[PDB]
Amino acid sequence: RANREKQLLDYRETYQKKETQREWDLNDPHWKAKDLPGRVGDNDPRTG
Amino acid sequence: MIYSDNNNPREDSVFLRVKRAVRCGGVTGPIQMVDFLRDFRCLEEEQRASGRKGVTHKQFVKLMEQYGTKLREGDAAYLCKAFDDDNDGYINPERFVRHFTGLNQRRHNAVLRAWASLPKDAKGRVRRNHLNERFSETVTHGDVWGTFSPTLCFEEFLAFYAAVSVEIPLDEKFELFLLREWCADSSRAPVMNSTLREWGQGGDPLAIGKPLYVQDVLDRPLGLSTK
Amino acid sequence: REAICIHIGQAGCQVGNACWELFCLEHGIQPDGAMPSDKTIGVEDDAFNTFFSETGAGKHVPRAVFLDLEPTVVDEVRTGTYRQLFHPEQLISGKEDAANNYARGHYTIGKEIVDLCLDRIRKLADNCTGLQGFLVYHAVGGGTGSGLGALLLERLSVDYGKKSKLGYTVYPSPQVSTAVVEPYNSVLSTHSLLEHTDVAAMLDNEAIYDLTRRNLDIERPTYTNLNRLIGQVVSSLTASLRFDGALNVDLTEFQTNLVPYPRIHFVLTSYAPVISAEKAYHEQLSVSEISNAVFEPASMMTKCDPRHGKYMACCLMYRGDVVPKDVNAAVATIKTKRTIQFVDWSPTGFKCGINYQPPTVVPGGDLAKVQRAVCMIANSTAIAEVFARIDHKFDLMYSKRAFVHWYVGEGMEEGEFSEAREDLAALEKDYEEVGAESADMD
Amino acid sequence: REAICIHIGQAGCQVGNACWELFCLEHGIQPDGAMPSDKTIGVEDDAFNTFFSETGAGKHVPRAVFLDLEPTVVDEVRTGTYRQLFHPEQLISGKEDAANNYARGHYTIGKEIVDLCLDRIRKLADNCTGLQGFLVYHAVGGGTGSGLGALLLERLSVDYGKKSKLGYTVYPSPQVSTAVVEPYNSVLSTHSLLEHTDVAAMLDNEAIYDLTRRNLDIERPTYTNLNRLIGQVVSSLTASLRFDGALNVDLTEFQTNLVPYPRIHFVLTSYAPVISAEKAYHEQLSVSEISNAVFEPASMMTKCDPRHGKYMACCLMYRGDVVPKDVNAAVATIKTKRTIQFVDWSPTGFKCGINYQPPTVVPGGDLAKVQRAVCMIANSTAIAEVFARIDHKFDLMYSKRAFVHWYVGEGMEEGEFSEAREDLAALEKDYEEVGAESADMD
Amino acid sequence: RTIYDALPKLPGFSFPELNPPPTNGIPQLCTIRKGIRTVFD
Amino acid sequence: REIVCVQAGQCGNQIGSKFWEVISDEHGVDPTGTYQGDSDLQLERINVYFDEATGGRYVPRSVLIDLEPGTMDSVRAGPYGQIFRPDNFIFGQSGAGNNWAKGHYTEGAELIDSVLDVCCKEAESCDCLQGFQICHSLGGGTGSGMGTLLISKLREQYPDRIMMTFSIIPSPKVSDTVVEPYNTTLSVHQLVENSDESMCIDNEALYDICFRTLKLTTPTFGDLNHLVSAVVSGVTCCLRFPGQLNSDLRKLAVNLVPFPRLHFFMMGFAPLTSRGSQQYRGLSVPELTQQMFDAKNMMQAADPRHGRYLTASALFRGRMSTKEVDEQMLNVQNKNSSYFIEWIPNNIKSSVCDIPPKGLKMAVTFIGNNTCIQEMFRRVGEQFTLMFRRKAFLHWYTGEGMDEMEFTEAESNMNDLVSEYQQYQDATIE
Amino acid sequence: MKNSVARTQPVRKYENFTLENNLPLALGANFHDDPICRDTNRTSHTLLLPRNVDYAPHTEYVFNGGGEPVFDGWMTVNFD
Numbered sequence A: 001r002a003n004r005e006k007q008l009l010d011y012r013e014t015y016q017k018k019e020t021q022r023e024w025d026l027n028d029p030h031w032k033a034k035d036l037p038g039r040v041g042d043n044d045p046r047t048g
Numbered sequence B: 001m002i003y004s005d006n007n008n009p010r011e012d013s014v015f016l017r018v019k020r021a022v023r024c025g026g027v028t029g030p031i032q033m034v035d036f037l038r039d040f041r042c043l044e045e046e047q048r049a050s051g052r053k054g055v056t057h058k059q060f061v062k063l064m065e066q067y068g069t070k071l072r073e074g075d076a077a078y079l080c081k082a083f084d085d086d087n088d089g090y091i092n093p094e095r096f097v098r099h100f101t102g103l104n105q106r107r108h109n110a111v112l113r114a115w116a117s118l119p120k121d122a123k124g125r126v127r128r129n130h131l132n133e134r135f136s137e138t139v140t141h142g143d144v145w146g147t148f149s150p151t152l153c154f155e156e157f158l159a160f161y162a163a164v165s166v167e168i169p170l171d172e173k174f175e176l177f178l179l180r181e182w183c184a185d186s187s188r189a190p191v192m193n194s195t196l197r198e199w200g201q202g203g204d205p206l207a208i209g210k211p212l213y214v215q216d217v218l219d220r221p222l223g224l225s226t227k
Numbered sequence C, D: 001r002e003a004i005c006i007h008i009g010q011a012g013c014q015v016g017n018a019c020w021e022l023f024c025l026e027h028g029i030q031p032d033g034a035m036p037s038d039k040t041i042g043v044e045d046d047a048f049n050t051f052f053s054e055t056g057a058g059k060h061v062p063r064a065v066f067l068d069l070e071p072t073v074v075d076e077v078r079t080g081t082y083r084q085l086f087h088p089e090q091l092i093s094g095k096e097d098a099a100n101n102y103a104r105g106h107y108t109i110g111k112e113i114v115d116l117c118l119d120r121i122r123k124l125a126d127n128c129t130g131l132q133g134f135l136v137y138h139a140v141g142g143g144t145g146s147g148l149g150a151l152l153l154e155r156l157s158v159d160y161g162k163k164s165k166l167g168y169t170v171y172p173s174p175q176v177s178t179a180v181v182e183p184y185n186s187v188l189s190t191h192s193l194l195e196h197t198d199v200a201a202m203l204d205n206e207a208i209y210d211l212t213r214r215n216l217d218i219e220r221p222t223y224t225n226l227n228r229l230i231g232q233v234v235s236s237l238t239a240s241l242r243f244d245g246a247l248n249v250d251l252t253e254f255q256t257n258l259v260p261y262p263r264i265h266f267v268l269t270s271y272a273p274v275i276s277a278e279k280a281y282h283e284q285l286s287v288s289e290i291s292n293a294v295f296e297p298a299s300m301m302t303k304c305d306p307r308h309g310k311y312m313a314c315c316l317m318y319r320g321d322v323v324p325k326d327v328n329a330a331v332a333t334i335k336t337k338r339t340i341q342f343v344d345w346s347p348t349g350f351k352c353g354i355n356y357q358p359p360t361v362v363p364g365g366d367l368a369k370v371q372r373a374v375c376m377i378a379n380s381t382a383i384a385e386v387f388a389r390i391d392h393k394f395d396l397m398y399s400k401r402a403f404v405h406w407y408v409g410e411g412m413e414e415g416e417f418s419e420a421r422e423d424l425a426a427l428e429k430d431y432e433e434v435g436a437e438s439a440d441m442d
Numbered sequence E: 001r002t003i004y005d006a007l008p009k010l011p012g013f014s015f016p017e018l019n020p021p022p023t024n025g026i027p028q029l030c031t032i033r034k035g036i037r038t039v040f041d
Numbered sequence F: 001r002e003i004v005c006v007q008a009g010q011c012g013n014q015i016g017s018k019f020w021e022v023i024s025d026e027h028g029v030d031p032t033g034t035y036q037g038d039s040d041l042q043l044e045r046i047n048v049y050f051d052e053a054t055g056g057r058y059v060p061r062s063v064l065i066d067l068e069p070g071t072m073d074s075v076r077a078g079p080y081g082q083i084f085r086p087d088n089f090i091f092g093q094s095g096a097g098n099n100w101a102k103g104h105y106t107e108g109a110e111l112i113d114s115v116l117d118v119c120c121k122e123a124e125s126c127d128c129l130q131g132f133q134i135c136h137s138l139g140g141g142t143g144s145g146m147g148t149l150l151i152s153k154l155r156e157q158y159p160d161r162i163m164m165t166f167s168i169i170p171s172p173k174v175s176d177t178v179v180e181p182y183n184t185t186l187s188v189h190q191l192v193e194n195s196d197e198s199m200c201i202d203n204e205a206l207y208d209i210c211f212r213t214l215k216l217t218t219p220t221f222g223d224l225n226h227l228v229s230a231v232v233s234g235v236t237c238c239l240r241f242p243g244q245l246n247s248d249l250r251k252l253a254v255n256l257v258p259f260p261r262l263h264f265f266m267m268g269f270a271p272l273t274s275r276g277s278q279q280y281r282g283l284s285v286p287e288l289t290q291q292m293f294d295a296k297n298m299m300q301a302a303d304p305r306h307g308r309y310l311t312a313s314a315l316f317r318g319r320m321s322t323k324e325v326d327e328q329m330l331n332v333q334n335k336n337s338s339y340f341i342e343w344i345p346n347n348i349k350s351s352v353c354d355i356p357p358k359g360l361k362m363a364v365t366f367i368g369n370n371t372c373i374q375e376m377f378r379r380v381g382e383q384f385t386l387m388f389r390r391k392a393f394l395h396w397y398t399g400e401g402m403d404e405m406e407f408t409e410a411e412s413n414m415n416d417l418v419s420e421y422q423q424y425q426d427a428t429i430e
Numbered sequence G: 001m002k003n004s005v006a007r008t009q010p011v012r013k014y015e016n017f018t019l020e021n022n023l024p025l026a027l028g029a030n031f032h033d034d035p036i037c038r039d040t041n042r043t044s045h046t047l048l049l050p051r052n053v054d055y056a057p058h059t060e061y062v063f064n065g066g067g068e069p070v071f072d073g074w075m076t077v078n079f080d
């Protein structure tokens, strides 16, 4: 029984990492650091 | 099932699918698993020789595809992040080896006992030619001799016998199978009845020898009727 | 053995997508409808039968229908990942929505689609040998969920007989809101649903958002998280039919234990080990701790406080590695508390269930992996506050005839408002009188 | 066996860091609570159970809550070295402080935060099987410590009932001072603490500064030194529950032996071998020498002189290599002294305890290593002088209503100042009456 | 045959987890069909 | 002299599986049905519980009934499940829902004819039939309704045999079902008229046995059902092995029941002891007698100190002298004289059997008839009156079709039973 | 207890015991109660914890003590 719970802890530590979750792009800290503003300079391709 | 029950809590569904793919592909499955471990070791050795600190994600998924894993959308990145500890695009070898040859506690102890039974020499490593004739008539799974590269270490042993673990759904049957496979049962502390137990001072319920009847004690001639 | 699931409208179809993702991963059916390569006739493998049927070629297909009036969500299912899992006939779609009008769904648009739905359910029920109930998912806040859900439950209730109908329902949150006309649709839906449902389980999105903020560590949750929690609760309640256990519970047992009087069929639901992986390593998760968890109102999926009422019956479902002595000790400890009160006419307040299969873990999920869980559905007089708060908003709006011309134009008599409001007033009086102590009644 | 610790505010959390550092190092739990990768259990024995509980995987977590209204100190605990030891729910932090107002802590803000604290303490108390008391650390000079400590002790006293509550309290020093409004908060705190505490131990920083200058050789002491001394005292008093000994003393025995009348529960504390490493090798440290040391006022941790009053009861705890015959000879010699006086109605003035475990040495500590120590808590009429000086300063400020508008703005009636002042005046008269000789009254 | 099952059937001598079930499902070995009961294995 | 067993409902089928495991072990029957025993003494009375099949096989005289096959599919899949005859499984298509009226009137009458056909086929095959033995719970739905229906039909069809029941009854502290008082009251009303002798068990008492006596860290329902299988197989042991003082179910009934309504008994089994303690106490007849009368070892919540014993019976297994058995029973009657009804000169019957269960040197099973059982019925009647005044959950039962007069009659009859026990407890010679 | 299930009652030494050293239990000679003769002072709830056992079981228990001539005519006579 003791080794059973130790292996369950191993599973939790290795397969359920925080960045693995599908909704990481919304709950990520530093999400405004990795994004770009609306327009960059005067030749930004994104500004249609 | 195997990744949902309490008996094997370390198992994961997608990694189970990966192991199923590498085992059932194509030389039988356990041979393929030993070969997979060997290729992982040689790849990490080559990378360490080059000057980079480990196998990357791209060649890891390339190796998986080479062994024939029909991956899906997002599972490759799932495994790459699962085995990346420092989060720097690299795969940790010790975690992957521990998970790849994973087994239950009882099965792991059975494998350890069997391995401790066989003799070794030099740096803890066995040779095929010294022991192939001694255990020829008792090894039912003859693929062990094919696993020898006539040498073999503990990691390949554990990988081989973890490969065969899926065929025996009972833990006790697995233990007895391995013990009668390699004759690892201890004379002093056995677990099977069909073994030559040695005690030193005899069994304590030693009921043999004397059936201990009661008519052999009674004095029959006293019952004669005389005046 | 078999149960049929009916998914209605937007919330019901998206929750159905999460539920069938979970049921596939728990039984092991691949997204292309195939058993894994290691399963054969070598060992007895039939647990899926409660939710799946196999074709003569060995493909699996699920016992469900998805109903919608707008195409977008079902077209997303048709173009998504599970395209090959569902039979194309099962995904039924109309041309245009009920535009938040219960009257449009019930009278104008649902009457055209309803005969196809009854024909499909009949075609499923003919391919069964032990159907034992319907599970229904819908929201009462929207037009098609309310109108077509009521019309379809009425038709099912006429065609079938002596069969249980269990509803999981998303009610309008007490201050979070999505549409202006929510009170009218919720009142008219609850009026039709009152006569034709055996047990109704209530869910509120505002409560599950609070639970995902409080228990899990998600700052910006979205509906997929809520749908995964709902899928876990339904999987826990239906696990008793599919896996070995000490005390099984058939769906007919819920109605017998939870409903004291035929109108008093609205129940609260809660789930215990809602926990993140990082918290899971700071705590042991024994039977008594999760049993203590299911009684806190912070664990509930509906925004109501049971301290403002009295419990009449509780049904506790334990799944996983649990021993009966611990279940008995836990229930005996809860009974001692003074802030938990039962009506004096209900002395034997508890029903227990014990199943051996622990909950399954989904690859992108946020719940930790745990060896045991407990789920609760309970009947309490506190529910009168939920109806009272919907009725006050109805009275405020109807006092000025705020939107009635829409409902009257799409085919409904104005009288139906007064009938439904009088029925909800009588339901409020039932909840007031039932809670009166017998000693004062002499 | 088990005891739960509640840490409130700045002094209580900072003293908690030193306490948990000592309890971890004395039992042997690693600062992160984990174990080496090859062991199956981190320690061979259960003795830690009084202060730590282990999970089924063997991680240790401590039985404590940290309560604060400002985040900074708790955020320092969250980012420090013991991050992995505590469960994150136990570290509770609000948004803004009680701003040195008892009224702000008691009525406006602590009233909002108190229910989370009670829920966490309940979750700890449910995971216990022989709880025998609460230990509380706080300062009565500040706003949140005074107001929320009083409110929480009142709620605890209703919910848990007979269970004992022992307080370690930092009172305002007689001439060292940090804030102007200290008298109002200390008077209102003492008013609440009279009804709702079983024994209260009082500490003053000016005494610990004097002790660190004379005995230790520290020219520039800081709060970490005082907090390590307080942690040593708490470890000495609770050692009787955790290690083998000749005469054990359960936490319930203190209240029975030290309190003669229900209001007379304020006790003085002192510790004997507070000594530096350079002095420790110049002197032997026998039982009689440390017993003679504990009665000198240079050894006390509260600034009061017991020669100006009469003792009612003394409790002497000896730990380490001590033999009972020497303790008896020492106590008889102390009894012989003429500057030590007992009230004539208290003939049997002493309670003794003897434990075999010597005091632990902390890597960064300033105390020397010694084989034995003794700690005393005693009830004496000399304590009346501390209240008289606080009451005089309160009377000076209150004659002109110097700051009352803050307290009235934060929610308190002006009447509460006058009520508390007559209750403390009555406590002064109680200390005058209890000290009157029976032979004089005939 | 083995030390795990070489004990008499008396209360307190059973160790259930030593023989864990490889599966937890319910087979359909007991069916009604059209009213003709089958107890097929 | 062979007994036929009936197992009904989930509790009955689960306890039955463990009972047939214990009986198959004692007679050395392999789970394939082959005899593998080690003494002829095992074979010469195998007929008592087993019928003989033609080849190398044995078949058990048991009928399995349930309304949904889930439990039957679990037991048939179990390790000993193969021994059962396939034709002996009778099942419907929808559950009882834990409702007495549904289990008794709608699906009960639908299946009862097929169950009676199987019971008659099994009974008429016997060369001499002994009583029937039935296991079921009283708080459930199919157990209570179909068990009492079948008991009534067998009492009409076999009034000269013995009717014995083992029954599970609601704990005084925690309920397992919300509607237990109705099902329990109606079932006790049916049993007191139909039954000859009935034993009652509280799961709470078995939990106290497991925690206090055996100190098991993680007990499971297999342990509780093993304790029950031990006592049930023990009461009949003298029927199927030789001994110095034979006994029989009819002789037990004649010595235990003074008046026909007073047939409810408590049970106990003695050599229960924790794995750590066995080194501290050798087996002897005084030790067995002391455990036999300790209320810690009794499987009901009522305690003997509030009532009096009218009669009791002790069946001893093992090689022992009759003098210590007789003198122990005399000493216990003399030392505790206030707890024994004074107008009966000797309340205890003893019986001795030579062959103990394997692995124990000696064993005894205890059956007791004590008036303290009236407090349990009083508690159930109180909860029934609380529920009925408010018509609690009544629409389910009334919707199936029952007349309320049935409820008032059953309550009145049970209340008269508690009054009758109270009058005989305080009776005097005068 | 609710701690880990792998814990077992610890092992204590209690050296300098007169009865183990071929000496009488004389007055004023109870050295094994001297705290200097112990190896630890930590109190452990032995009344709840189980004991440690190591042995090789018996694997089996005994309960019993161990313990053509057809006629087709052609009658022939032999005097054996």
Ligand SMILES: Nc1nc2c(ncn2[C@@H]2O[C@H](COP(=O)(O)OP(=O)(O)OP(=O)(O)O)[C@@H](O)[C@H]2O)c(=O)[nH]1
Binding pocket: C008, C009, C010, C011, C012, C014, C015, C069, C070, C097, C098, C099, C100, C101, C139, C141, C142, C143, C144, C145, C146, C170, C172, C178, C205, C223, C226, C227
């Ligand atoms: N939990 C949950 N709630 C949802 C979901 N989708 C919508 N809701 C809620 O349900 C209500 C809206 O009901 P809808 O399902 O959009 O209404 P509808 O059935 O589409 O009706 P029509 O608009 O006429 O087509 C709002 O309270 C939403 O918050 C979902 O996926 N999960």
Ligand SMILES: Nc1nc2c(ncn2[C@@H]2O[C@H](COP(=O)(O)OP(=O)(O)OP(=O)(O)O)[C@@H](O)[C@H]2O)c(=O)[nH]1
Binding pocket: D008, D009, D010, D011, D012, D014, D015, D069, D070, D097, D098, D099, D100, D101, D139, D141, D142, D143, D144, D145, D146, D170, D172, D178, D205, D223, D226, D227
């Ligand atoms: N011995 C000791 N005294 C301290 C410590 N920290 C603060 N104090 C004293 O306690 C009093 C200040 O109380 P605080 O704890 O700062 O008050 P608070 O609980 O933060 O209340 P708020 O200011 O409203 O947040 C002063 O007399 C300080 O000298 C400490 O770590 N040790």
Ligand SMILES: Nc1nc2c(ncn2[C@@H]2O[C@H](COP(=O)(O)OP(=O)(O)O)[C@@H](O)[C@H]2O)c(=O)[nH]1
Binding pocket: C246, C247, F008, F009, F010, F011, F012, F014, F015, F096, F097, F098, F137, F139, F140, F141, F142, F143, F144, F168, F176, F177, F203, F221, F224, F225
């Ligand atoms: N001792 C024991 N009690 C059981 C067992 N199975 C169920 N019970 C109890 O019996 C009651 C439930 O009755 P049940 O058998 O489900 O009734 P049914 O639905 O008519 O078959 C509850 O009090 C359960 O605790 C078992 O294997 N052993």
Ligand SMILES: [Mg+2]
Binding pocket: C009, C010, C070, C097, C142, C144
């Ligand atoms: Mg829509």
Ligand SMILES: [Mg+2]
Binding pocket: D009, D010, D070, D097
């Ligand atoms: Mg502060």
